[PDB]
């Protein structure tokens, strides 16, 4: 479907646009896709960007008739240096398959159940292992803990929907009970491919200050979490100004951890000011940094 | 090999092969070679899963004639030598 | 080039100037059953004549 991919490209561009003007600029040169796509660990937002692709464009006129087939691509998003980025839909198995795999997997378990019965034995968990995540109910469930409780749940889907009516916030995954359904996708390989495909950890850090904290050793760094401090600042008595302005810190650690890109001297346009008594030049006013 | 990272067959790699062949034949030869590689030599290194990706995966070049069919014949059925 | 919303391959691009082309009846005149594709009709035709 053209327009959906179209909406992807738009929307994602619009979000990066948000983070961008979150400081002040749209300039593409400041924001190489490392910035937005490095996993949180390295200090990036880690947003999973499936925009890019290349988007079949052909000659709409007839494509209101024939399905003329792809004659051209329109570059969905861009870069400055390109590389690429792996995009999700490559890491997600399509439905047809998984229903096929499901069908067979549960056939095998039909047999192995018949044996382990007839032999009056109890399961190998190996005989089951290769199939561990295969199957649409996802065999793991059979052996999840609480089963002889959850036998007495029924009709979970509908409830998982009419929650539409019964509560305020979104719950964007209704369509599954991860208890009944197993878990229908895993990713992490994504993280790996975005990490290296950016040019490897050794380049990615060339953007940061990581040669300014004097660590010669990288991987020994866990960061640290400021998340915990959340309860003990206060609970109520912040006036609204202190709730927001006391919410603008966890940005301003990030935009420091990539400083030397965000401030950089191939900037397209800006009027240079050295800071007051320092030796640093800033290109344009960027208030946070 | 990426196809074998992928935990199941996917139509993707089949249409990739096909639209690569019909661009030029040097790719055609390159394939039939690789079929030699994998079947003859390199089967020994694959677990009884990945055959689930392969067997179909050549199934789709061979049904539709991109292989072409008779290049199968190089494959043999013997207790003599078959893995 | 502009006013018809084309781009000569080496050309300056401009704006639709008559933006909404999307209104259309479902109408048999120019349809496919009735039209024969022999020669493509590149743009530069449409900018030439």
């Amino acid at each position: 479907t053209e327009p959906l991919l179209d909406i992807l490209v738009k929307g994602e561009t619009r979000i990066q646009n948000r983070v961008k003007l979150g400081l002040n600029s749209k300039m593409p040169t400041r924001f190489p896709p490392a910035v937005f796509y490095t996993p949180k660990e390295l200090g990036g937002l880690g947003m999973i960007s499936a925009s890019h692709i290349l988007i079949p464009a052909s000659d709409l006129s007839w494509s209101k008739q024939t399905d003329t087939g792809i004659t051209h691509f329109r570059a969905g998003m861009t870069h400055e240096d390109e590389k690429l980025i792996p995009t999700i839909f490559r890491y997600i198995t399509t439905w047809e398959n998984e229903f096929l795999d499901s069908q067979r997997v549960w056939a095998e378990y039909a047999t192995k159940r018949q044996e382990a019965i007839q032999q009056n034995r109890r399961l190998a968990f190996e005989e089951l292992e290769g199939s561990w995540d295969r199957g649409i109910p996802r065999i793991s469930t059979l052996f999840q803990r609480d089963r002889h409780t959850l036998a007495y749940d029924r009709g979970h889907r509908i409830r998982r929907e009419f929650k539409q009516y019964s509560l305020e916030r979104n719950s964007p995954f209704w369509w599954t009970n991860s208890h009944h359904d197993g878990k229908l996708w895993n990713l992490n390989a994504y993280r790996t491919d975005v990490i290296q495909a950016l040019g490897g950890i050794e380049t990615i850090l060339e953007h940061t200050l990581f040669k300014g904290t004097g660590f010669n050793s990288w991987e020994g760094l866990f960061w640290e979490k400021a998340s915990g401090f959340e309860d003990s600042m206060q609970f109520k008595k912040l006036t609204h100004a202190q709730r927001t302005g006391l919410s603008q810190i966890p940005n301003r650690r990030f935009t420091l951890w990539w400083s030397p890109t965000i401030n950089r001297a191939n900037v397209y346009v800006g009027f240079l000011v050295q800071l007051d008594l320092t030796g640093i030049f800033l290109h344009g006013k960027i208030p946070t940094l | 090999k990426s196809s074998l990272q992928e935990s199941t067959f996917s139509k993707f790699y089949s249409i990739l092969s096909e639209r690569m062949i019909t661009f030029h034949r040097s790719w055609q030869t390159a394939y039939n070679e690789t079929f030699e590689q994998n079947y003859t030599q390199d089967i020994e290194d694959y677990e009884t899963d990945q055959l689930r990706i392969l067997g179909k995966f050549w199934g789709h070049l061979i049904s539709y004639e991109f292989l072409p069919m008779d290049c199968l014949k190089i494959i043999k059925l013997t207790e003599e030598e078959s893995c | 080039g502009k006013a018809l919303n084309n781009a000569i391959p080496g050309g300056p691009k401009f704006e639709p100037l008559y933006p909404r082309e999307e209104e259309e009846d479902y109408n048999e005149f120019n349809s496919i059953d009735r039209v024969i594709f022999r020669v493509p009709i590149r743009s530069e035709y449409k900018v030439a004549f």
């Binding site: 490209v9 464009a57 051209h72 | - | 933006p19």
Partner: peptide, 27 residues
């Protein structure tokens, strides 16, 4: 040879507008 493939323009659709021949599908 903008033939009718492509966009009216990339102003709002956020791409670069670039359209290239597709090597894949000819036959």
């Amino acid at each position: 040879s903008y033939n009718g493939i492509g966009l009216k323009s990339a102003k709002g659709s956020s791409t670069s507008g670039h359209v290239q021949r597709s090597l894949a599908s000819n036959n």
